[PDB]
Design a protein around this ligand. Structure first.
Ligand SMILES: Nc1ncnc2c1ncn2[C@@H]1O[C@H](COP(=O)(O)OP(=O)(O)O)[C@@H](O)[C@H]1O
Lengths: 509, 514, 500
C-alpha cells in the first residue's frame, strides 16, 4: 500500500469484496448463503446480519463496514444489507473520481450535505396513516403482513395468517429482539387451521402412558425449572453384603434408588405443581411423578427456559435444591393437544405475555420455512413502524425518490461537488438494482421504466418483486419506516465517508 | 471482447487528439516519415498526417476526415465526442445493455439534439442585433496578441465586411477573406490602420503624366507592359543568321510603345503593369518613359479586376495585349485620389461600383509587431467570415454541449425504454468538449464543467433566466463568460453536422461486434 | 548517499502525517499491538502506534514528544514543518550547499523568526475566566482535532477549565479528566466538578460531604472454592465464614470511621449482595469496578495509601476529596468525588459517546483543548494561526534573505519556503489546489492585512481574514513549535551516517 489514492483504491476494492458477501442477499427472495464454521458445521442464513456475524472479517476497511453493519443490526437488523450495499456503491461511484485525483475531503463534505438534504427530503415526503385503533387499520396491518406473506398466495387463510400474527404482536409486545415470539411448523394437517398458542411450550411429548391420561387444563400451575434428571442405568451403588436372611438384599436395591425417590418427592413437594427438565426422564420416573399427582416434561430446549425467564416469570432450579414455591413461576393455561401428529404439550399464559408464539401445520416443509422468514419480516416491520413517527414507501421506491431529488439538486449546484452528488445519486440506485437482479436479473429493463415514470411526476412508485413490474409500493402495503431509513442512510453515509477519509493503514507488529 | 478492444483503440486515438482541442491546445508530435517530424496543434492536420494500425481507429478517422472535408473545421471535436460516447457505450455494454440498444439511444439523442439546437439556442443571422458588440468581443478574443487598441479593429471589421456582398445561390451574404486586401506596413504610431473602402496600391511617381493623382470621375481596368529586355520573342533560334534575332526584340519594344500610345490616348488613368518585367527593364523604363507600376500583387490584380466589374480576359486573350483593347475595361470607380497617406505614397480608390472589394493599410511601427498585426487581422477577418457566412450561429464553447447534456438527461428521465440509459449517458459523455476545453485551459475541469451544468440547469428549468442559456468556455478564464457580451461562436450547421457525424461514427463502430 | 537516506525517513514521516494536519484532514486507522482497530486524527497517537525503525524518524518522534511535554498544541506542526525543512535542506544539498552553512542559515533564520513572531501577535486573551473569549480560543484546537463539534466542545472546555483557575498564577492540567459513557450521544456530554465514574457503587446513596475516603485498590477478591484433594470440597463453611468475615470487617469499618472518617470506599474486586445489605445497614458506598489507570490516578490525586488488602480503614489513607456525591446527568448514574476549596479544585468532563473509536478521538481532542488552555494560561498572547502566521514568517524571512548577503541566503530562502510548506499542506488536506491558494494568500500578504488566512471550507482557493473568523492560535505554542522543529531538524541534518 501507499499514501493517498493507491491505498484508498485498495479500500474501495476491500469494500467491494465485503459487499460481495452481502450483494446477493438484499431482497426477501434473495440468494441464501451457506457459511461453514471452522468446526466443520454448515449453517444457512439469507439475512446479511447473521452472515456477517458468522463471517470473520480481517481487512480493516471490511472491518469498519461490518462494524457499522453490526451497529445497524443492533438498531434494526435487516438494514445491515442496505447500509453495506450503500457504503460499497458510494465507494464504487466515487472510485473513478477519486482515482482521477480529487481530494477525498471534497467527497466527505459532498456526502455530508447530500445526506443531510436526503434526510430533509425523507422527513418532508414521509406520510403517516397510523391511527391503528379502528378495525379498518387493524386489517390494514393485516394486509401489510399479507403483502409480506404473498409468496404463499393462499386464499382467505392468507388473511387469517396475517390477522393471527398481527394480533399476536399487538398484544402487549414492545420493541425487542422478537426471539421469544417465534413460530414452529408441523407436518400433516390443514394449513387452514393451527393453534394461536398463548405463550410457549414443549415441542412433542413422548409415548408414555402418563401422556394419554395427563391432567389437562391446570387452573394455575406453579412450574418447576429443572435440568438434572432421573433415568435408568445412570447411577448405582457398589455395595457388598454377606447373607444373613433373604430380607436383607433389599437394602442394596433400596440404596440404589432411595436418594432418587426422596429427591423427586421433595422437589415435587417444593411448591411447584408442574415440572420441566432439559434432559431425558424415565417412564418409571413419570409414573412416580403421577404418584405425586404430577407430570414431567423432559428434553426441553433451552429456548423454552429463556422464554420461561422472559414470559413465565420463573427462576431456574436445576437440581433438588430450592424446596420452596417462592422462586417458582406461574401459568394460567395448560393442556396437551396433539396437533395432527405433533404431540405438543402446552403450558401457557404468563405473568408477562411477551411470547404468544404460533405453531404452523400445513403438511409440507418447503413452504413453511420461507413462511417462517416471511412472518418474521412482517411481524418485525409492523412493530418497528408503529414506534417510528412516520413511514415511507420502501422496496426500491424511496431510493429512487432520493436519487431523482439529488440528481436534480446536483445538476443545479455549482462547483466540483455536483459530479460527486450525481455519483452519490447514481450509487443510491443500487438497492432497486439489486432487488431487481436478485429477483429476475432484468434490472435494467424494469429500472429504466421505473426511473422514467418516477421522473414523470411525483409518485412513490418502485419495483414489485411479486410480478417484476412497477407497482404502487405505497398502497401496496410494502413499507420501510422513515426513521429507520434515516438511520440506515445516515449510517451508510458515515461508514462511507469514514472509510474514504482514511489514507494510510498503520501496523506495528 | 474484440469490440472492447475497438473501444480501447478509439480511446487511444481520441486521447492523441484531446490535448489539441481549442486554440490554447497543446502541440503534438507525430512521425509519418523517419526523415522529418511535424509540429502542429491543428486537429485536421494531426488526424490526416497520423495513422493508427487498428481498424477501429481507421474507421473513426475516416469518418472524421469525411466530416472535415465536407463541412469544414471540427474534426477534432468529432473524434473526441465520438470516441467518448464510444467508451461510455462500452461502459453500458458491461452493464449488459446490448449494443443495438445504445445504437437506438444514440440515434434518438442525435435526433433530439438536432431538434433542440435548431429550436431553442440559435441566432437568426442578425446576432440578435448586437453585431457591433459581439464583433467587439470577438476581435478581443480572436486577437489576444493585440491587447490594448482593441475596439478600433471591431469598428472597422463590422462595416468593412458588411460592405462586402458575394454573389451565389440565392445570394447568400457570405463575405470571403479575400474580399479585404491586407497591406502589411509599418513606421508610424500604433494607434490606427486606415481601411480602404475599396482598394489601394502604389505606382511610379514623377512619371504620373495622368490624372490619377487627382479626383477621377471615370477609371479603367487596363493591364500594362513595357519591355526592352527580350520579353517577346516572335522568332526562335531555329536558324543561325547572326544578325537576325535582335530587330524583332527592339521592334516589339517599339510596337509596345505604340500599344501604350493607343492606351494613353484613351486615358482612364487606371493602368497596371503585369508580371514578367525584368529588373533591367524596371531600371530602364523609369528613365525611358513608362506608365508602369512596380509589378503589384497579381492576386491583388485579380481581386481589383473583380472589384471593378471588368477583367482584362473579357476583352484581351492574355495579360500583355497586341490586339486593340475594347472599351469593356472602362472602369467605374466613384472616387480615386492619391494622397501622401500614412506617410507613404499610396493610391486610394473608394468603393468601386458594380462588384467591389475592401482593403486596409497598416499604420504600424516596426516590422515584427506589425507582422503580428497582419496575422491578427487575418484571424479576425477569417473568423468573422465564419460567423456571418454560417448565416446561422450556435453559442460556441461548451455552452451548447452542456445545455444539450442537461436537456438530454432530462429527456432520458422522460423517455422510458430499453435505451433509457443510452440517452442520459450520451448526454453525460457529450460533456467531453467542455471537459477537454477546461483541461486545455489550465483550469480544473470538475469545477468549470460543474459551473456550466449549474448555469444551464438554472437557465432551462426556471424561464426567468433565458439569457443564462448562453454561457460557455473556450479559453483560459477564471469564470465562464456569457456569449452575449462576449462573442466566441461556432456555426450551428457545422456544429450540428459534426455532432451528427460523431453519433454516426459511434453507431458504425458499435455495430461491429465480433 | 548516507545523508539523503537519513533525510528520506523524515520525508516519508512528513508525508505520513501531512494528510492529518488540521481541520478537514485525512483520517487514519492505526492498529494496536493487540490488533485493536480505531481511526484517529491526532498525529501524536499516529506516531504512538506507528513504529519508526529509522533513527531520523525517531528524532522527529521525540521532537514531537518534547512538544507534548512543553505545550500539546502544535505537535503535528513540528513534524510536518521539520519534514518540509529537511525537504528544502535536501534541495540545498543537491544544489551543493555545505551542511554547516545550511545549519548556520537555519539557526539564524529561526532566531529572527523567534524575535519577529511576537510582532505578528494581533491580540491577546485579555479576559480569561469569561466563557465568551475562552470558548472561541478553544474552538481552534477543537476544530484542529474534530471539525464536527466546533463550538459545543469549546464551550464545555471553557466552562470546565474556568473552574480550575482560581489561583491566577497557574494550575495543573491533570485537574481536568475524562470519564466514559458508552452508547450515548456526543451532544449529551456535560461538565461536572470533581472526578466522576459511571460504574455502579454498592450501597444506598448517602453522599456524606465529609467522607474522608478509605482508599484501596482491590480490598475484595473473586469466587474461589477449596478442593479436599483433586476433587472439590463439600462444605459451605468456607462461604459462611467468608460472609461473616466481610460483615465484621465492615463493622470494624464503622468502628474505624473515628480515625478514618470513610463513608465511601473503592475496589476493583467483586462483592455480593451480602456486602450490599451490610453497606445499607452501615450506610456506606463501595465502587465495585474501576480500570487500572482510573484506580492509580485516584490513588495519586486522593493523596492517600491504596492497597488490595481485606482490611478495615486505617489512619494512613486520609481522603482528599472528602465531600463525595453522586449524579445521574446524561441518563447515567455517576459517583462524584469533590472538595470545596479552590486550590486543586479538580473537575471532569462526562464524555458521552456511542462509539469508543470516536470516544478516544474526542478524548484526544479534549486533551489538546486542555493543553491549549494551559498555553493561554502561561501566555495570553495569540497569533493568527491557520497559515496566516506561516506566510507572514515566510515573507519576513524572504525579505531577510534578499537583504542579507552571504552563503546562508539559500538557507534563509528555503527556511521561508519550509514555512510556506505548512499552508500548502493544509490546502492539500482541505481539498484545494495548493499552488493557486498559496500564490493568492502570499499576494494578499504583500500589502495591507497582516493576519489573513485561507478559508478551508471553500471549494475555490479562498483567503479570509483570521481575526473576524476567530480561529487564532497560541503565541507561545507556535514559538516553541518552531523552536523544537528547527532544533530537531538541524540535529537530524547534522548527522552524516548512522552506526550499528
Ligand atoms: N477552521 C480553520 N481554518 C483554518 N485553519 C485552521 C482552522 N482550524 C484550525 N486551523 C489551523 O490548523 C492548524 C493545524 O495544527 P495541528 O497539527 O492540527 O495542531 P495539533 O495536532 O497539535 O492539535 C492549527 O494550528 C490551526 O491553527
Amino acid at each position: 500500500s501507499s499514501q493517498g489514492i493507491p491505498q484508498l483504491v485498495s479500500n474501495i476494492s476491500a469494500c467491494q469484496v465485503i459487499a460481495e458477501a452481502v450483494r446477493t442477499t438484499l431482497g426477501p427472495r434473495g440468494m441464501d448463503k451457506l457459511i461453514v464454521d471452522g468446526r466443520g458445521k454448515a449453517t444457512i442464513s439469507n439475512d446479511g446480519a447473521t452472515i456477517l456475524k458468522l463471517l470473520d472479517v480481517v481487512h480493516p476497511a471490511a472491518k469498519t463496514l461490518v462494524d457499522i453493519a453490526k451497529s445497524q443490526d443492533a438498531e434494526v437488523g435487516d438494514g445491515t444489507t442496505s447500509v453495506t450495499l450503500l457504503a460499497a456503491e458510494f465507494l464504487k461511484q466515487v472510485k473513478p473520481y477519486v482515482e482521477e485525483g480529487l481530494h477525498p475531503q471534497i467527497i466527505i463534505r459532498a456526502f455530508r450535505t447530500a445526506t443531510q438534504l436526503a434526510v430533509n427530503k425523507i422527513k418532508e415526503i414521509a406520510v403517516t396513516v397510523k391511527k391503528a385503533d379502528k378495525v379498518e387499520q387493524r386489517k390494514l396491518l393485516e394486509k401489510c403482513a399479507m403483502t409480506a406473506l404473498s409468496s404463499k398466495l393462499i386464499s382467505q387463510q392468507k388473511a387469517f395468517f396475517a390477522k393471527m400474527v398481527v394480533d399476536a404482536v399487538m398484544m402487549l409486545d414492545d420493541l425487542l429482539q422478537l426471539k421469544m415470539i417465534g413460530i414452529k411448523k408441523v407436518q400433516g394437517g390443514a394449513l387452514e387451521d393451527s393453534q394461536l398458542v398463548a405463550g410457549v411450550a414443549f415441542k412433542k411429548t413422548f409415548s408414555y402412558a402418563g401422556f394419554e391420561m395427563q391432567p389437562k387444563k391446570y387452573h394455575n400451575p406453579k412450574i418447576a425449572l429443572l435440568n438434572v434428571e432421573l433415568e435408568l442405568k445412570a447411577e448405582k451403588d457398589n455395595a457388598e453384603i454377606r447373607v444373613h436372611t433373604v430380607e436383607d438384599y433389599q437394602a442394596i436395591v433400596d440404596a440404589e434408588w432411595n436418594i432418587l425417590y426422596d429427591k423427586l418427592e421433595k422437589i415435587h413437594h417444593s411448591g411447584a405443581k408442574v415440572v420441566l427438565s432439559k434432559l431425558p426422564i424415565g417412564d418409571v420416573a413419570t409414573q412416580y411423578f403421577a404418584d405425586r399427582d404430577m407430570f414431567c416434561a423432559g428434553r426441553v430446549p433451552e429456548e423454552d427456559l429463556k422464554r420461561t425467564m422472559m414470559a413465565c416469570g420463573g427462576s431456574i432450579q436445576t437440581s433438588v435444591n430450592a424446596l420452596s414455591a417462592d422462586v417458582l413461576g406461574r401459568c394460567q393455561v395448560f393442556e396437551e393437544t396433539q396437533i395432527g401428529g405433533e404431540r405438543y404439550n402446552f403450558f401457557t399464559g404468563c405473568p408477562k405475555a411477551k411470547t404468544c408464539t404460533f405453531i404452523l401445520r400445513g403438511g409440507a416443509e418447503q413452504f413453511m420455512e420461507e413462511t417462517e422468514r416471511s412472518l418474521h419480516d412482517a411481524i418485525m416491520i409492523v412493530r418497528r413502524a408503529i414506534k417510528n413517527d412516520s413511514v415511507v414507501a420502501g422496496g426500491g421506491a424511496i431510493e429512487m425518490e432520493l436519487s431523482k431529488y439529488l440528481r436534480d439538486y446536483s445538476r443545479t449546484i455549482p462547483g466540483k461537488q455536483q459530479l460527486l452528488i450525481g455519483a452519490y445519486a447514481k450509487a443510491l440506485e443500487i438497492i432497486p438494482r439489486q432487488l431487481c437482479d436478485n429477483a429476475g436479473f432484468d434490472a435494467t429493463n424494469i429500472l429504466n421504466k421505473l426511473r422514467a415514470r418516477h421522473a414523470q411526476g411525483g409518485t412513490w412508485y418502485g419495483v414489485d418483486i411479486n410480478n417484476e413490474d412497477i407497482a404502487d409500493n405505497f398502497e401496496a402495503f410494502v413499507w420501510e419506516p422513515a426513521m429507520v431509513r434515516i438511520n440506515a442512510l445516515t449510517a451508510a453515509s458515515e461508514a462511507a465517508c469514514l472509510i474514504v477519509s482514511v489514507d494510510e493503514t498503520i501496523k506495528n507488529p | 471482447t474484440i469490440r472492447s478492444q475497438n473501444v480501447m483503440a478509439a480511446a487511444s486515438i481520441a486521447n492523441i487528439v484531446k490535448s489539441s482541442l481549442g486554440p490554447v491546445g497543446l502541440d503534438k508530435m507525430l512521425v509519418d516519415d523517419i526523415g522529418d517530424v511535424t509540429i502542429t496543434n491543428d486537429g485536421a492536420t494531426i488526424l490526416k498526417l497520423l495513422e493508427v494500425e487498428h481498424p477501429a481507429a481507421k474507421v473513426l478517422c475516416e469518418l472524421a476526415d469525411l466530416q472535415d472535408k465536407e463541412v469544414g473545421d471540427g474534426t477534432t471535436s468529432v473524434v473526441i465526442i465520438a470516441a467518448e460516447l464510444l467508451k461510455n457505450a462500452d461502459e453500458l455494454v458491461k452493464q449488459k445493455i446490448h449494443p443495438t440498444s445504445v445504437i437506438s439511444g444514440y440515434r434518438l439523442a442525435c435526433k433530439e439534439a438536432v431538434r433542440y439546437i435548431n429550436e431553442n439556442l440559435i441566432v437568426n443571422t442578425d446576432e440578435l442585433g448586437r453585431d457591433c458588440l459581439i464583433n467587439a468581443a470577438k476581435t478581443s478574443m480572436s486577437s489576444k496578441i493585440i491587447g490594448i487598441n482593441g475596439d478600433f479593429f471591431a469598428n472597422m471589421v463590422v462595416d468593412a465586411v458588411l460592405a462586402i456582398k458575394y454573389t451565389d445561390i440565392r445570394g447568400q451574404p457570405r463575405y470571403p477573406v479575400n474580399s479585404v486586401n491586407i497591406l502589411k506596413a509599418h513606421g508610424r504610431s500604433q494607434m490606427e490602420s486606415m481601411l480602404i473602402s475599396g482598394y489601394a496600391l502604389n505606382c511610379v511617381v514623377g512619371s504620373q503624366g495622368m490624372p490619377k493623382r487627382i479626383v477621377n470621375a471615370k477609371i479603367a481596368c487596363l493591364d500594362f507592359s513595357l519591355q526592352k529586355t527580350k520579353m517577346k520573342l516572335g522568332v526562335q533560334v531555329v536558324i543561325t543568321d547572326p544578325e537576325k534575332l535582335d530587330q524583332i526584340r527592339q521592334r516589339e519594344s517599339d510596337i509596345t510603345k505604340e500599344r501604350i500610345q493607343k492606351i494613353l490616348a484613351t486615358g482612364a488613368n487606371v493602368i497596371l503593369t503585369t508580371g514578367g518585367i525584368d529588373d533591367m527593364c524596371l531600371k530602364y523604363f523609369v528613365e525611358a518613359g513608362a506608365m508602369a507600376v512596380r509589378r503589384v500583387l497579381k492576386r491583388d490584380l485579380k481581386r481589383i479586376a473583380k472589384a471593378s466589374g471588368a477583367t482584362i480576359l473579357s476583352t484581351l486573350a492574355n495579360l500583355e495585349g497586341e490586339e486593340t483593347f475594347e472599351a469593356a475595361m472602362l472602369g467605374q470607380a466613384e472616387e480615386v485620389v492619391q494622397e501622401r497617406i500614412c506617410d507613404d505614397e499610396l493610391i486610394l480608390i473608394k468603393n468601386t461600383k458594380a462588384r467591389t472589394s475592401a482593403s486596409i493599410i497598416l499604420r504600424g511601427a516596426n516590422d515584427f509587431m506589425c507582422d503580428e498585426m497582419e496575422r491578427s487581422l487575418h484571424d479576425a477577418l477569417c473568423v468573422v467570415k465564419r460567423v456571418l457566412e454560417s448565416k446561422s450561429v450556435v453559442p460556441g464553447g461548451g455552452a451548447v454541449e452542456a445545455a444539450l447534456s442537461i436537456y438530454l438527461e432530462n429527456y432520458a428521465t422522460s423517455m422510458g425504454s430499453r435505451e433509457q440509459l443510452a440517452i442520459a449517458e450520451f448526454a453525460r459523455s457529450l460533456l467531453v468538449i467542455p471537459n477537454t476545453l477546461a483541461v486545455n485551459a489550465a483550469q480544473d475541469s470538475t469545477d468549470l464543467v460543474a459551473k456550466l451544468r449549474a448555469f444551464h440547469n438554472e437557465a432551462q428549468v426556471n424561464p426567468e433566466r433565458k439569457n443564462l442559456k448562453w454561457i460557455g468556455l473556450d479559453l483560459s478564464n477564471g469564470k465562464p463568460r456569457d456569449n452575449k457580451q462576449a462573442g466566441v461562436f461556432e456555426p450551428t450547421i457545422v456544429k450540428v453536422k459534426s455532432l451528427k457525424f460523431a453519433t454516426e461514427a459511434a453507431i458504425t463502430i458499435l455495430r461491429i461486434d465480433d | 548517499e548516507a545523508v539523503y537516506r537519513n533525510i528520506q525517513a523524515c520525508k516519508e514521516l512528513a508525508q505520513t502525517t501531512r494528510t492529518a494536519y488540521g481541520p478537514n484532514g485525512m483520517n487514519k486507522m492505526v492498529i494496536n499491538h493487540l490488533e485493536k482497530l480505531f481511526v484517529t486524527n491526532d498525529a501524536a497517537t499516529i506516531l504512538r502506534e506507528l513504529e519508526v525503525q529509522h533513527p531520523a524518524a525517531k528524532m522527529i518522534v521525540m521532537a514531537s514528544h518534547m512538544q507534548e511535554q512543553e505545550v500539546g498544541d502544535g505537535t503535528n506542526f513540528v513534524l510536518v514543518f521539520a519534514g518540509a525543512l529537511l525537504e528544502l535542506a535536501e534541495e540545498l544539498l543537491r544544489i551543493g550547499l555545505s551542511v554547516s552553512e545550511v545549519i548556520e542559515g537555519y539557526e539564524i533564520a529561526c532566531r529572527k523568526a523567534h524575535e519577529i513572531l511576537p510582532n505578528l501577535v494581533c491580540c491577546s486573551a485579555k479576559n480569561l475566566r469569561d466563557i465568551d473569549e475562552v470558548s472561541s480560543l478553544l474552538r481552534t484546537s477543537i476544530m484542529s482535532k474534530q471539525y464536527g463539534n466546533e463550538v459545543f466542545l469549546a464551550k464545555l472546555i471553557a466552562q470546565a477549565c474556568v473552574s480550575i483557575f482560581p489561583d491566577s498564577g497557574h494550575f495543573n492540567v491533570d485537574n481536568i479528566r475524562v470519564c466514559k459513557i458508552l452508547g450515548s450521544g456526543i451532544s449529551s456530554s456535560s461538565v461536572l466538578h470533581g472526578m466522576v465514574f459511571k460504574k455502579e457503587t454498592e450501597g444506598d446513596v448517602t453522599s456524606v460531604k465529609d467522607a474522608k475516603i478509605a482508599v484501596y485498590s482491590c480490598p475484595f477478591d473473586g469466587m474461589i472454592t477449596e478442593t479436599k484433594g483433586t476433587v472439590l470440597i463439600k462444605t459451605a463453611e468456607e462461604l459462611m465464614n467468608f460472609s461473616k468475615g466481610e460483615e465484621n470487617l465492615m463493622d470494624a469499618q464503622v468502628k474505624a470511621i473515628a480515625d478514618t472518617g470513610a463513608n465511601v470506599v473503592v475496589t476493583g474486586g467483586k462483592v455480593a449482595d451480602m456486602a450490599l445489605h451490610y453497606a445499607n445497614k452501615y450506610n456506606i458506598m463501595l465502587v465495585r469496578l474501576n480500570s487500572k489507570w482510573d484506580l492509580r490516578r485516584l490513588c495519586k490525586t486522593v493523596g492517600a495509601t491504596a492497597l488490595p488488602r481485606l482490611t478495615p480503614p486505617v489512619l494512613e489513607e486520609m481522603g482528599h476529596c472528602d465531600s463525595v456525591y453522586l449524579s445521574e446527568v446524561g441518563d447515567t448514574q455517576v459517583v462524584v468525588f469533590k472538595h470545596e476549596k479552590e486550590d486543586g479544585a479538580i473537575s471532569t468532563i462526562v464524555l458521552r459517546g456511542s462509539t469508543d473509536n470516536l470516544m478516544d478521538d474526542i478524548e484526544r481532542a479534549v486533551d489538546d483543548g486542555v493543553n491549549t488552555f494551559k498555553v493561554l494560561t502561561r501566555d495570553k498572547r495569540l497569533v493568527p494561526g491557520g497559515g496566516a502566521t506561516e506566510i507572514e514568517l515566510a515573507k519576513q524571512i524572504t525579505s531577510y534573505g534578499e537583504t542579507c548577503p552571504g552563503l546562508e541566503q539559500y538557507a534563509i530562502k528555503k527556511f521561508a519556503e519550509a514555512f510556506e510548506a505548512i499552508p500548502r499542506a493544509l490546502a492539500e488536506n482541505s481539498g484545494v489546489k495548493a499552488n493557486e491558494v498559496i500564490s493568492k494568500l502570499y499576494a494578499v500578504h504583500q500589502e495591507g492585512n497582516k493576519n489573513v488566512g485561507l478559508d478551508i471550507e471553500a471549494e475555490v482557493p479562498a483567503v479570509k481574514d483570521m481575526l473576524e473568523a476567530g480561529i487564532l492560535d497560541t503565541y507561545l505554542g507556535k514559538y516553541w513549535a518552531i523552536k523544537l522543529a528547527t532544533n530537531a531538524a538541524v540535529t537530524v541534518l547534522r548527522v552524516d551516517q548512522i552506526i550499528m
